[PDB]
Each structure stands twice: as C-alpha cells, then as structure tokens.
Amino acid sequence: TTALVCDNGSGLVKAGFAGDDAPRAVFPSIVGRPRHQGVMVGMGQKDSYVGDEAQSKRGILTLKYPIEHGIITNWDDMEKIWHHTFYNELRVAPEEHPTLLTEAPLNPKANREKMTQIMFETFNVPAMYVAIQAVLSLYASGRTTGIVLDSGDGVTHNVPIYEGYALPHAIMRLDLAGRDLTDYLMKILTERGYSFVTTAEREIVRDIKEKLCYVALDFENEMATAASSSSLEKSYELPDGQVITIGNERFRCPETLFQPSFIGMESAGIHETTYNSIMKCDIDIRKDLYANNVMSGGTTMYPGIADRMQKEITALAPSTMKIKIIAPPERKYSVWIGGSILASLSTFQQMWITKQEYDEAGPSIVHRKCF
Amino acid sequence: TTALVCDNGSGLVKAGFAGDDAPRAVFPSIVGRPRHQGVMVGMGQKDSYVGDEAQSKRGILTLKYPIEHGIITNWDDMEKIWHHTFYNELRVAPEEHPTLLTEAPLNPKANREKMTQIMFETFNVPAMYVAIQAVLSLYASGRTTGIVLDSGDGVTHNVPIYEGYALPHAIMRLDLAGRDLTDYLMKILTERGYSFVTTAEREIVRDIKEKLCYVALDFENEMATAASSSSLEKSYELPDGQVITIGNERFRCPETLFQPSFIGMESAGIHETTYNSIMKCDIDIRKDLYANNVMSGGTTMYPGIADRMQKEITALAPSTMKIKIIAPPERKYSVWIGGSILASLSTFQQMWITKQEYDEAGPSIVHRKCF
Amino acid sequence: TTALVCDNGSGLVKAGFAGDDAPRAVFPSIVGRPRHQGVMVGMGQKDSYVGDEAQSKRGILTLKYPIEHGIITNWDDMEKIWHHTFYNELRVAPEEHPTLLTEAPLNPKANREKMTQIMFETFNVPAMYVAIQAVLSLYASGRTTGIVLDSGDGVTHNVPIYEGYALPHAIMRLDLAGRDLTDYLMKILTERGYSFVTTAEREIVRDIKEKLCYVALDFENEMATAASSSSLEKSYELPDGQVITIGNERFRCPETLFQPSFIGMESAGIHETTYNSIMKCDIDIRKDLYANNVMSGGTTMYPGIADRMQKEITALAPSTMKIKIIAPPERKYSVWIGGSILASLSTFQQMWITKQEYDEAGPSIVHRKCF
Numbered sequence A, B, C: 001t002t003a004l005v006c007d008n009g010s011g012l013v014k015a016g017f018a019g020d021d022a023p024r025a026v027f028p029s030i031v032g033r034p035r036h037q038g039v040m041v042g043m044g045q046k047d048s049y050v051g052d053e054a055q056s057k058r059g060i061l062t063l064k065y066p067i068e069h070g071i072i073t074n075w076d077d078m079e080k081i082w083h084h085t086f087y088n089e090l091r092v093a094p095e096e097h098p099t100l101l102t103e104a105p106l107n108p109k110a111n112r113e114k115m116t117q118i119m120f121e122t123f124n125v126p127a128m129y130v131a132i133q134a135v136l137s138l139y140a141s142g143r144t145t146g147i148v149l150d151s152g153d154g155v156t157h158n159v160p161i162y163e164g165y166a167l168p169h170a171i172m173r174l175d176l177a178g179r180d181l182t183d184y185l186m187k188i189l190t191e192r193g194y195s196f197v198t199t200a201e202r203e204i205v206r207d208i209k210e211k212l213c214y215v216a217l218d219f220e221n222e223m224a225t226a227a228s229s230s231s232l233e234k235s236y237e238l239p240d241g242q243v244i245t246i247g248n249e250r251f252r253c254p255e256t257l258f259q260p261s262f263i264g265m266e267s268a269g270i271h272e273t274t275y276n277s278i279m280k281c282d283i284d285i286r287k288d289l290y291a292n293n294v295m296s297g298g299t300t301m302y303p304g305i306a307d308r309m310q311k312e313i314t315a316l317a318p319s320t321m322k323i324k325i326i327a328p329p330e331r332k333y334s335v336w337i338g339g340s341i342l343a344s345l346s347t348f349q350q351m352w353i354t355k356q357e358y359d360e361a362g363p364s365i366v367h368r369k370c371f
C-alpha cells in the first residue's frame, strides 16, 4: 500500500505517511523516569513517559535524550521511542508498512546496522531504507543543484550536490548544535542571576531561545547599542508567572554558530564552513553552488540568519558572484518532506531492502549506496 | 604599604594581611537580632551582634546569613560584616590599605558591581580586585596544572587549569553545600527523635557534623555492619550537658555529596562531576589533570573523603591512568593563602583597580579578567 | 668555515651541518597559539610555541602549518620557524655560516624570491643556494642514473636523471600528500565511530598511521580476508589510555596513493605516474630507468610499498625488462643527506650566491640554474 516516513533526530521525532503535506506526529525525543521515588508498583504509576507525556509531567521526571550528536546512545530508550511513535501516535501496525529512515552524513556504521537489526527483529517491516538528510532536504526544495546546509539539534552538516550528482568527498559535519546553543544560553543567562540547573529547566531555556533569540546582523554594533539602549531588552514569563528580562544574551546566543570560539570550539562558523566546502569543489561547480545555498532544520530558523549568512559569504567570495541563500518558512520539516517525496517516487521503489534480502545478505547490505 | 586579603563566603569570613601564613580573623558570617523583644533602647543593649558575639549570645538571637550560595542577599547586613571585619577585628582603617576580594566562578554580575560600589563609596579603599576561588586555591598548592575541586558552605565548583592557562568553558558549579549537608543532617537526626528547629540549634547540628561525620569508604558494607554492630555508634554532649548518640547518620550525611539524590537533587556526585569536567577537556590535557586533583574548603575535610574520591574515580577512568588526589591538612585556608600569595606577588601589582580609574570607567571595569 | 644544510617541508624541518651523517634538529613545522584565550601578557606566558614545544603543549593550542603543498603560505610563522631552528635548536648565529635550501620541482617563483629576501634581510647569511629535492635524493644514493620518486608531507614529485644529466621536460608533480592521507584516515576512522576533529587530534591520527598503516600487497584479496579474519585488527592506546581497534582501514589508507580516486582526485597512482614519466623519456633511457627506481621521504616508508610498486610496474612494463626498486631504511633523511654531500663537495663551492652578488643583481638571480 503506502510507506511510513520517519525522521528522528536528537531534538524531535517527525513521522507520518508518504505523500502527506506535513508530519502527523511531532514530539520531543525524550524519555522520562520518576525522579523522587521508585515507583509505587502496586498502585502502578507509569514507570516511564515519552514525548509530550514527559513534557506534561516534567517536574517530577528526569529527561533523557537517547540520541547524542545524531548517534543513538541508548537502544532501550530508542525502542521505547519507536514503539510510542507507531502504536500511540500514528496508530499503525508496522507489520504492514515499509519505513524510510534517516541519518547524518558521516556516522558510525554500527549505528545503521543496529537500527536495521532492531527494525527487522523487534518490529517487523516489509522493507526499509536509510537516507541522508541533505539529499532529502534538496528534494524538498525540488532543486537538482545546490549546497545544502542543515543544522539540527545535534549536528550541523553540509553536502554539495551538482546536477543531481552528489559528492562524497566534500561532505562536512560539525557537532555544533542546537543543544550546544542551549547549554551556552544557560551559562550566559547566569550572568543575570537566572540559574537553570535541571534538565526540566533546560527545556525552559530551550523555549526561551526559541521565542526570543535572533541573529544580530552586525554583532559589534548591536553589542554597543544594547549597552546604551534598553530597547533590545525583552520579557519572558515563566511557567509559574515569574518574569525574566533578557538583554544582549538575546542575540549573543546565536552568535556562537558564527563564532564557535564563544562556546570554546575550534571551528569555522557555518559561513566559513560553507565557503570552504564550496572551495573544495571544482571551479566550474563553484559558481552554480554560489547560486544556490539551502537551509534546513530548526537551528536555521533564527530571525536574520540568512541576511547575516549572505552578508558574511558575500565578503568571502569574489565580488562578481551572485550569492543566493534560500529559506522557505517550512525549513524544520524540509527533510521529512523530501523523504515523503522520495518515498512516493516510483523510481525509488527498487531501492527498498526487503526483509528476506536482509535475511540472506546479513547486516552489511544496508550500506549499499544508490541514487 | 601592604594589602588586605579577604575571603568571605556563606559560612565564614577569612581575613588578614598579605604575606601572613594564615588569616588573623576568622568568624561566622552571621548577624543576629534580639528575638524575644524589641530593644530597651533607652538602656541601650546593642540592637545587633556580628560573628562570635552572635555565637556567644546565641539563644536570645535569631541568626541570619547575608550570603546564600555565594550571592550576597542582604547588603544592610553585609556592610555590617565588613565594618565589623575592618574596625572591630582587624583594627584597621580601610582608607589606607587596598583589598583583595573573592567570588565563586559563575555569579550575577551585579553581585560584583554592587560589592565594588560599596567598597569605594561606603568604605574608601585605594585599590581593589576580585579573584576566583579555584585560581587562588591552586596558587596555594603552588601547582601550575590540575583540576581544582573546591567545596565551601554555599557552593561546590570545579575549574581545570593547565600549565597556568585557565579554561572558562569547563567550569562547573553545584549549589550542593555544607549548609545543604547540615539541613539534611537535621532531618536524618530526627529519625532518632532529636529535633533541631531553630537557627541556634542549626549551629549545634553544624558542630555535630564537624566533630562526628566522616565519609564511608564503601557505603553499602558500612550500612550493613552499622546495623549489626553498635561499635560505630558514638556520643555527643549538648551545650547543657544532655547527651546524644548517633549511628549510621554519622557517615550517611556525607554520602549526600556522592549521591545528591539523598537530599533530592538531580546531580552527579563530586566524583562524577570531576570526571565529566576532565572529559570535557582535550584528550592531551586529561592525563595531566588525572595526575592532579586538588581539594579546598571545609566540606572537603571529612575523614576518608580523598580515599573514597580516588576509589570512585579509579573505577571511572581508564585503568592505565595514574590517578592522584591531593589534600593538605590546611585546605580550609587554601583560598585565603592563595590570595595572600597573589597579592604579595609583585607581578600582580598592576592589576589593582585604582579608585580614580573606577571613578572614570564606571562599574563595568571590575569584570576584566587577569592573570 | 662550514655550511648549514636545511630541508624544510610541510611536515618537518630537517637541519644540521654539512658533512654530518644525519640532521641535528628534527621537529614538526608547527606554530601553536593559545586557543582558549588571548595571552595574559602581564604574567607573560609565551604567545606562541614552535616544534616540540607545540607538540608538548598540544591540547591548549591550535596548530598551524606555514607550508601548504610545498608553498610557504605564512611568512610571519616561517620566520618564527627559521629563528627557532637557528637560535634555539642549532644554537648557531647565521651571520657566520652559508646555508643550503630546498624546494619542490615546480613552485611559484615568488616563493623562492621571498625566502631569499628574508634570508638576506631578516637573517644575515654569507651565501645561499636553492636545490631540488630529487637531485639531492639521488646524490644521497650516490647513483648517477635513475628516476627519483619523492613523497613528503605536502607533495609527490618525479624527476628522471640520466648519467648525471637532468631532464626538465619530464618532471611530474602531485599534491597527493602525507597530509592528504591523514585527512582521509580521519574520515575512514569515523566509520568505526572515532571522531578526530581538532588539529591536536589530527596529530594523533598522524601518529596512528605512522605506527599502524601498511601497503596491502594485493588490495582486493586483503579486503576479502580482513572481513573474514579479525587477525588483521590491531590495537592503539590513546594519550589518555583509552584504546582503539583498527581493521581494514589499516591498509585501506595507504591504498589512496595507488588509487587517488579514494580521496577523489583525477590522478594516476604513483606507479602509473612513474611509468608515464619513464615513457615520456627517450626509448634508450627507458631501460636504464627501469633498472633504477629510487624512493625518498616519509610517505614512501609504509611497509610493503616497494613490493607493491614493483608488482604493479612489472605488470605495466614489457615483460623482458628487469624492473628494480630501491629503498634504504634511511629514506626520510635522504634529501638532507644528499644536500650535506653536495654542500661539502668542493666542486659546488662556486655555485653559492654571495650576498653582494644578490645585492647588485636583484632577486631574479636566484633562479639561475646550475649543475
């Protein structure tokens, strides 16, 4: 019949059906355990909570993420997140529907092999595939040529694609992160005397940056003017109706993506990583990549991100280049939309790995590479 | 001439002169008010008492601490504690001597700015500086490389330092506390029927843990043997000569530092916080940090603390590491000794903020960071 | 008196005195700057570190190489590397001794002119010369005829020489590299989940390939057998005593020299480049070149390199040729030894450019070509 399309990352699950316009389930990739006691098992409160249940009952729980930096670090909790995805949120038996699954570009091979083993053995699925976030993100724009830049909760990566050919050699990946921006915002907020210690408070700091942070177009002038004018300062009201006021932290937090030395990394910013990835491509490609830069995933969504990115790339590139950066408003769903398209496309249908073909071939078969 | 060095925390003041071997004044950071009546102002008993006066006349007073978790929460009483430090205990006019002042690593900026404003305006001081407890604590050992772990009345923090470079990114701070161990010991003592309600009784429970508590090397075996044998049980005699007998509470109280879930926090223990802070450092540094772990402040002083800390770190680290933990007996004065050294060091002498330079620059100047 | 002989490349400096058997100083061509802060200049830790200092204090620094692909890309750091060579490591005043200097075969002319200008103006040297790595490498073997193949950190080049005549027309150069093998090994290691991001980790991956990599004699059979048998898998212990296990990556990395399509280049391998360079020589020479193939520089030093090189050339050449490939164990020092010999040789002594002769002639004189 029809095929499930699943995009699961360090910050969310996005799952649904091929050919829908948007995901049906979006929920945090979180499992929570009772913190203050071992369970009153005879009365039988749930021993664990997943997604929006764990976000509702936040304060009593400790919130774990099964996926660190795009790598599944706890399989016991990742089987809970897939079970909760299929049975509770989609209301689907996975026995009927093939599934489409997603990874970051450069990733331990066992992270794919164990995911495949679990999806055939603990769940039963007619056929499966694993796809790259950047390829799907490009199909979501419909373009055949461009350099995708994709930044999620756990990873930032770049993949150049030219005329529908794809280049393994110029892939770049950073572990600079949405999380790695949250953890910086916790520290920088501490400068005002707001201390956010627990993981449940970390979810408050995440929501604070999602509402309030933006990319300063010119950082040094906005730092200068924020000291002089309180006009930048803006208010947030906590779950218990206390109130918070935030100043230069508001733009200073997204600055870490352009200057990771703030968090303390050796890295190029996302702009210098994009320019260096373009320059590693052959000189004929480079004009056509400068004509397309494409942004996907939530960390891209800060206000003014593309205006700064263009302002900094224009200063690096030769001045005779047209430099163009592309954002739909839909960017956070772009990878899932690309997977929906690819799964629906009849041309794809031979690429599914059949369970029998896995059974004879053994786990290595998943790594076979296809366009 | 010579420079005052002041280390003031949630549990004590340690003050004295640069180049002395130890503080000259040590007294509780306490202000006490008459509890049972308003003063007979015409007869004119003192309306407030500070430090050892308030500890001598304990029962009639209510004892307040101006500093909560390293943050000065009452300035009216903190000006009383500085006035009582300089005029009554040191017998010094602060008009002549520059002063050196100390904070926890991550702290509201206004807590430093208001302290500086008060020290120039309400008291007159030729020059001032603010220093970090971990840096001073490392100078007190003389080492150039190590991970300091410093635990006071109000805060626990870690700062890695390598070859005299210092790393802002890997600082960690807990609000687990000497106080937060006292308040647990009050509860755990209640299990035997000794109820300590008032702040004056809280000072008795503090002195009980200071005399009697120790860190159980292996907790579960000592819990098992304490139930069987009364040999662990030991006697304390109260101010009025009544007597108290205390069993497994004696080690169970310091266990909270290793397992803060006892008090009810989400935290790593001090061992897992130290190991995680080492692991956030680059792999070359990590061997040299494992070779040095340094302990400062009174909460470190429980018997067997370092033997347990080493036993638990050795189980976390790769087994080929030499793991070394360092305690002088002097640890409670270590921060003050480090400040004495730093103030005496001629290299430092340009780092003082002159009152005129503050007057022109305004309060922000205090945050400039220096070695 | 006596003459300094200097061989400086993208991966090392090899320097010493003419007529010695080996270099006196060998140290990385690295300059390191404090990464976590700008220096605390008043306390005055060194603002930069060079060679083995930068390798000792690796974790706190960011490591730059001044030379990319045999071209000096940062002169500010290259003057630091020459200063550290003469004053700190050799303990020599360059005012007294003439120096002998080395380049890759085809290289920007300004790279020679600026080096000469610096060596007369910022350092004072009685006379200078620039020499080709392949010529020196051949003098180190003492042969008069052969095709040298020289592979360093940054460049691979070939020069045919016949009866002590040298042929400009058949020089070939590749930017396939020791570095370009390290950067591939970082990626291929990522397949096992070991991520090496920083330049200090890049030095660990360099040391991993230097200890563990080897040239697979037949690649496809060893790929087949490595999957079946764990016997190839071998262990490496990190700076912090963690352990690493490496399988088919161990030979797959040196395979890139034979098949640069792995890294993604259009190139012949070193074998097909050598065969094509021989074939560009006149048919009488070609037998005498097949009788001598000579290997110099560290990238040549992988185990089994010559056995594979001979096995692949023997399959290309006419079967009636004796095909002979020559490796001392000393190959990494071979260029320096050849320069030591050439500088000591009295016949050479007229070829030095005197400082006065440079002063009158102007910079172009350096390019005059001499045997």
Ligand SMILES: C/C1=C\[C@H](C)C[C@H](C)OC(=O)C[C@H](c2ccc(O)cc2)NC(=O)[C@@H](Cc2c(Br)[nH]c3ccccc23)N(C)C(=O)[C@H](C)NC(=O)[C@@H](C)C1
Binding pocket: A190, A192, A193, A194, A195, A196, A201, A238, A242, A243, A244, B069, B071, B106, B107, B108, B110, B111, B175
């Ligand atoms: C409701 C919240 C905050 C507050 C009640 C909201 C109000 C509005 O903030 C203030 O401005 C008040 C004040 C404060 C006090 C002095 C000052 O010069 C500036 C601020 N600061 C505080 O009460 C600090 C003190 C503190 C602890 Br201990 N360690 C810390 C580590 C670093 C910094 C500061 C601290 N404090 C106890 C908290 O944040 C607690 C843990 N925070 C929360 O539970 C979350 C859910 C947010």
Ligand SMILES: C/C1=C\[C@H](C)C[C@H](C)OC(=O)C[C@H](c2ccc(O)cc2)NC(=O)[C@@H](Cc2c(Br)[nH]c3ccccc23)N(C)C(=O)[C@H](C)NC(=O)[C@@H](C)C1
Binding pocket: A283, C068, C069, C071, C106, C107, C108, C110, C111, C175
């Ligand atoms: C766009 C192009 C050139 C450049 C960017 C255009 C600019 C304008 O040329 C310069 O003048 C800059 C600079 C340079 C550096 C120092 C110097 O005293 C003179 C020039 N030289 C370089 O970046 C060299 C260095 C180099 C490699 Br590795 N091996 C080589 C072998 C021989 C010579 C030099 C080299 N370099 C990396 C390239 O050429 C690359 C491969 N070239 C190209 O992709 C083509 C399509 C043309």
Ligand SMILES: C/C1=C\[C@H](C)C[C@H](C)OC(=O)C[C@H](c2ccc(O)cc2)NC(=O)[C@@H](Cc2c(Br)[nH]c3ccccc23)N(C)C(=O)[C@H](C)NC(=O)[C@@H](C)C1
Binding pocket: A069, A071, A106, A107, A108, A110, A111, A175, B283, C190, C192, C193, C194, C195, C196, C201, C238, C242, C243, C244
């Ligand atoms: C000491 C070292 C490695 C390790 C601790 C040594 C141990 C022995 O390796 C493992 O086998 C464990 C594990 C792992 C987890 C799951 C799995 O199916 C296989 C391995 N992988 C990891 O912890 C990865 C995860 C990762 C980050 Br984030 N981005 C990445 C990009 C690509 C791939 C993987 C990753 N990780 C955090 C690291 O490597 C860190 C950055 N590495 C280092 O600091 C250097 C100095 C080497």
Ligand SMILES: Nc1ncnc2c1ncn2[C@@H]1O[C@H](COP(=O)(O)OP(=O)(O)O)[C@@H](O)[C@H]1O
Binding pocket: A008, A009, A010, A011, A012, A013, A014, A151, A152, A153, A154, A177, A178, A179, A206, A209, A210, A211, A296, A297, A298, A299, A301, A302, A332
């Ligand atoms: N509107 C927004 N503005 C700013 N940041 C956002 C926004 N929406 C999500 N984010 C951040 O982006 C990350 C989630 O991105 P996403 O691509 O959904 O992650 P994943 O790829 O794991 O699903 C989180 O760090 C979240 O805080």
Ligand SMILES: Nc1ncnc2c1ncn2[C@@H]1O[C@H](COP(=O)(O)OP(=O)(O)O)[C@@H](O)[C@H]1O
Binding pocket: B008, B009, B010, B011, B012, B013, B014, B151, B152, B153, B154, B178, B179, B206, B209, B210, B211, B296, B297, B298, B299, B301, B302, B332
């Ligand atoms: N010998 C000891 N044994 C156990 N606890 C102690 C000892 N000495 C001090 N303490 C406790 O440690 C805290 C004082 O630590 P200290 O570092 O002096 O605080 P501060 O940093 O405020 O000066 C108090 O809670 C005190 O009860």
Ligand SMILES: Nc1ncnc2c1ncn2[C@@H]1O[C@H](COP(=O)(O)OP(=O)(O)O)[C@@H](O)[C@H]1O
Binding pocket: C007, C008, C009, C010, C011, C012, C013, C014, C151, C152, C153, C154, C177, C178, C179, C206, C209, C210, C211, C296, C297, C298, C299, C301, C302, C332
């Ligand atoms: N024993 C070895 N085995 C494998 N590779 C080596 C060995 N020794 C050095 N190398 C590599 O060769 C390069 C150094 O070669 P070298 O000729 O000394 O460079 P340079 O010409 O710059 O001095 C580096 O990439 C180093 O990793």
Ligand SMILES: [Mg+2]
Binding pocket: A009, A133, A151, A152, A153, A297, A335
């Ligand atoms: Mg994503």
Ligand SMILES: [Mg+2]
Binding pocket: B009, B133, B151, B152, B153, B297, B335
């Ligand atoms: Mg202290």
Ligand SMILES: [Mg+2]
Binding pocket: C009, C133, C151, C152, C153, C297, C335
């Ligand atoms: Mg060389």
